[PDB]
Amino acid sequence: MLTAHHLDVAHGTILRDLSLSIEPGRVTALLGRNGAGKSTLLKTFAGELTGSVAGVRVTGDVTLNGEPLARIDAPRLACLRAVLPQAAQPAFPFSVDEIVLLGRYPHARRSGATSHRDRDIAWRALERAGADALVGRDVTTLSGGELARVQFARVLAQLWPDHPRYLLLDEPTAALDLAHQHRLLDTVRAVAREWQLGVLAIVHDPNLAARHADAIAMLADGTIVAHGAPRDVMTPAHIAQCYGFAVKMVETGPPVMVPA
Amino acid sequence: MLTAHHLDVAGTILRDLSLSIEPGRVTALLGRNGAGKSTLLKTFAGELTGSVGVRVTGDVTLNGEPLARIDAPRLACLRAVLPQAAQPAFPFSVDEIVLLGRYPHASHRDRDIAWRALERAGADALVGRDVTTLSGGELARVQFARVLAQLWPDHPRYLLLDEPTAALDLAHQHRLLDTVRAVAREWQLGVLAIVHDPNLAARHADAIAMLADGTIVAHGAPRDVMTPAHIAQCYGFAVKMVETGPPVMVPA
Amino acid sequence: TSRRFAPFVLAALAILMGAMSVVALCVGAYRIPLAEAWAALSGDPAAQQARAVLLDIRAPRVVLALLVGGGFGATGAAMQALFRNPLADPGLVGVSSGAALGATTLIVLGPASAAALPVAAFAGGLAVAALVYRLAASRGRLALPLLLLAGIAINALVGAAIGLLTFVADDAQLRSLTFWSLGSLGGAQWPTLAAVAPCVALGGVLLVRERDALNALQLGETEALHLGVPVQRLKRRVLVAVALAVGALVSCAGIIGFIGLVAPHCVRLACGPDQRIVLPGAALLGALLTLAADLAARTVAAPADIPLGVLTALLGAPFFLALLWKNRGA
Amino acid sequence: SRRFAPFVLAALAILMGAMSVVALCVGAYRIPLAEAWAALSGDPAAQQARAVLLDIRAPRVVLALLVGGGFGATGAAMQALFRNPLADPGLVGVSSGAALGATTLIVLGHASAAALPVAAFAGGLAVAALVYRLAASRGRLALPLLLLAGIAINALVGAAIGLLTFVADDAQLRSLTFWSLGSLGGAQWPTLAAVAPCVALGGVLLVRERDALNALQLGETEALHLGVPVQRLKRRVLVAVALAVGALVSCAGIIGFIGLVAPHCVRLACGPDQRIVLPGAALLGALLTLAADLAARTVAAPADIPLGVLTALLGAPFFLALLWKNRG
Ligand SMILES: CCCCCCCCCCO[C@@H]1O[C@H](CO)[C@@H](O[C@H]2O[C@H](CO)[C@@H](O)[C@H](O)[C@H]2O)[C@H](O)[C@H]1O
Ligand SMILES: CCCCCCCCCCO[C@@H]1O[C@H](CO)[C@@H](O[C@H]2O[C@H](CO)[C@@H](O)[C@H](O)[C@H]2O)[C@H](O)[C@H]1O
């Protein structure tokens, strides 16, 4: 598993005694108000804060399938985890084909082999991202929604099964329209179940985390203040201290958070 | 009454669009990305009809007279725009920003208003702070206080929100939308706001207009408009509605 | 809604500048104490030659240093507001290049009236500052990115003409070009200041008449438009005012040199971005810094008279080294 | 998949070669092609035409190819490393260093005559290295801080250059002024015996980084997640650039828009993939410079126009063009 045990990250401490584990096959959604430290915790699971990169000091164990992250080379690490970020407007007008292929960079053997399996994976990843209509296109004529499908294609390409890995979503779901957001978190869950992949996704709408996550970690002031299935964690008292927001729950035919 | 009748904008991104913002009431505008929400808002603001390369046709009127015929600096005293809090190029104090709300009016009753604007927006602890030490939530609150400073009454004006709820937290985007209505009502003031979360508009609008491919496809109170088939042809998204005792939208 | 207790900062600089200014007259190549120099300028029949060295050789140079510093300080404050960016230099308008084109066109194509050189630099300064504006504006919307792109392109073409003209220049012409291009207040005489000063003051007036609109524009261009600021008319009025003051100054000082970046940046860090403080604030501090720089040249290596551009670069370098050290981490 | 441009590369090649021949058969010392072929063939009647072709005219052609090729490829690399088309090989401060190296030699002293490129070369690299050290923090290099360190050191450098120009005499002024204007009139074989391997090496380090460069143009954080040593690569690209551009400007003076223009054309022609753009740029760079330097030798002969002048008369319509391009 991908695991933080008694994690501290530090300018004071932004993460204080934090313990969370990402389970292969299951999707863990990360909730918290702005500044709660969600994006730090995720950078920490990426390994941006531990190794020959930083002055910020980190304490406690963080573990990927059994070894401390700090002992995992950025090249090797690029094969066990991938990060789907956000503000994807590229600096130069690459093609879609090129963006996705770049996800095969940590695998390309010579240095940038672009082998035939790689062009297939790139096509099959564009397939599951639902972006295969966009083969050819200049990435700068793409709506933010199309581009967001392409970046998802590219991050799948990097994790494609070959010869347990981890996918870290950094608020991928916002600025997608409604139907789009549910589409992506459904596919993410499917991939996580099919490839035995551990997913941590930072999500804004707690109702959205409720429908698509197997597990929820509510992060309040550098610490995880609730963890577990959407049924048990999603409660008025928890939403209360995580968000300062007085809510109530309501049923359907997964239960929805509602104000007042 | 701030009204658009048979309004076209140019390809063409708004096709034959009729809608009216009316004082005391908050209309919320819903649509998916690329539906022309932001174009229509700029149109009401008077950005595409004064003197400033695109084609606009139809009547857009503010309290009777056509927008095409209202100076920018007088227009600035009839409407204001909440643009979602950006941190300026240089480190002004919170006071200097709010007082800038008073620029179309400019002093002495100014400093008094800027205070009472800062208070209604719940951003008065922030006085004398540098805006670049502010979190985006405080920054949002201060920008809100600047727009209230601009529309403040003394001796029917309009407030347009270009997605100010954006990435405020859950509890603060609710406060802001509530306090807009509260001010819309007291100062008798027409509010048009682009909202992302359809349930957020349900809970705080008086009227919901849905935008689908350049044109309006529904208009009325949340109760009558928030239907699965409207959400379908607006968002291409299959939902159902659940009660509460404000009925909330849910997929499946 | 309080304030920041600036105006003493403004007052101090005015005093410090004024003081320094007075001492500047006594420490040039002609050394004279405050007493004897007062007496001479006040009509003492015993010091008719001393009045002539001070009122004819020293004064125009000290006054030119105040016009240059105050000029660059104020136009920089305006441009940095206009571009919402502390790195906008007054040069970018186009005007510096045209000065250097017109100055070199005249030095090298002789076929000399001492009013011929500044008038040429001033015409070229405004012409290429006006040509760059037309290339960027579309009758009539002025995108600041396009103004910068026209500038890059028109600057490439003017440097082509300059090097071509340099290439063909004989020894005397080359010596003017490089001297003028290192910046010097050593050409300062009253008849030209009669012409330069009203330009700089009229540019100065036009900027002041825009201190509120510029403050509103610091909020966002679209934000300011919503407040009623006519941001397109505002862009053009600042540029023509900057072009008019800088063009007058480069015409008789040459290329200098970092003040319009440094001065409005310290005044800002002391009093905030409020255009109502910064524009007179930066001009006082600019006049104070330029004069400190010219007092330094006429002194540190006496009797050599070191190019002023060299000394103002020795302010720029520590200023940007301070910026660097400050914005580590960030 | 959607991008077959190796014909673009191959075309640029043919056009470059073609231009090379055309440059060898023109023009100041009047040689008709018949005397040109006889001279190259060993006919003793064409003995002087041969010395011109091989000792005067060949070194300038090969130098123009080295200059244009070196600036195109390092433009290609700088713009990928900074993910901005406007990044220019000079930002390291190599160009000022060379100016300061060369102008302290012209104005003080001493030795001769291949001493001018060595001073210019040691000056570039030293100012390059200083600008690097001021920005890095042992060991993380932010590219904003690189620029500030550059602005600052170029301030300091420019003053030292201003002070030398000031105390210089009329002969020494004639030398700076023209040294900084650009020229290939110097070119002889022993010169570019040294320069060529210097820029031959730089180009090898850059091609050796092309795949990491492509990942980088996707995101500094994105490249980092794919396994690129983003810190080690910035330092690697910067050295290689400071190295070929240093050797180049040390014996050509300051030129002059090519490192911007050629990569931007191949990027418009073939997209941004570093695997095509660096050879493409190096190729089109060498082609545009030869063409420029040919015009300088012959447009006003026997005047030898500084080539800084001509390569600016190239950047002017280019920037004027992509103005006109991006009005929207
Ligand atoms: C805030 C920005 C505004 C700052 C204004 C700058 C102040 C500069 C004033 C320029 O006015 C000049 O004053 C000189 C005073 O000496 C006059 O010379 C006069 O005195 C000279 C000294 O001998 C004589 O040579 C001249 O004939 C005689 O005109 C000169 O004509 C006049 O134009
Ligand atoms: C990837 C880079 C590809 C670009 C190719 C450029 C490579 C240039 C390397 C320079 O090599 C030179 O070749 C000359 C050949 O002529 C030699 O001159 C020799 O021949 C000359 C005339 O032919 C004589 O004048 C000289 O004395 C004699 O050294 C010279 O020594 C040698 O250093």
Residue numbers in the entry:
A (entry chain C): 1 to 10, 13 to 56, 59 to 167, 174 to 263, 267 to 273
B (entry chain D): 1 to 10, 14 to 55, 59 to 112, 119 to 167, 174 to 263, 267 to 273
C (entry chain A): 24 to 134, 141 to 359
D (entry chain B): 25 to 133, 140 to 358
Authors' text:
Most pathogenic Gram-negative bacteria transport haem across the plasma membrane using an ATP-dependent active transport system, the ATP-binding cassette (ABC) transporter system. Here we describe the structures of the type II haem importer system (BhuUV-T) from the Gram-negative pathogen Burkholderia cenocepacia. We successfully characterized the structures of the ABC haem importer, the Bhu system from Burkholderia cenocepacia, and showed that both BhuUV-T and BhuUV adopt an inward-facing conformation in which the periplasmic gate of the haem-translocating channel is closed and the cytoplasmic gate is open.
L177, L178 and I181 create a hydrophobic patch and the cytoplasmic gate is open, as shown in Fig. 2b,e. Inspection of the superposition of the two structures revealed that the dissociation of BhuT shows a slight change in the relative orientation of BhuU (∼2° along the axis perpendicular to the twofold dimer axis). Although we should interpret the structures in detergent micelles carefully, our structural analysis showed that, in the absence of ATP, BhuUV without BhuT is still in the inward-facing conformation, indicating that BhuT dissociation is not a critical factor that imposes the conformational state from the inward- to the outward-facing conformation and initializes the haem-transport reaction. Turning next to the TMD–NBD complex of type II ABC transporter in the nucleotide-free form, both BhuUV and MolAB4 (33% amino-acid identity in TMD) adopt similar inward-facing conformations (rmsd of 1.1 Å for 205 Cα atoms in TM helices), whereas another haem importer, HmuUV (45% amino-acid identity in TMD; r.m.s.d. of 1.7 Å for 185 Cα atoms) and BtuCD (37% amino-acid identity in TMD; rmsd of 1.9 Å for 191 Cα atoms) are in the outward-facing conformation.
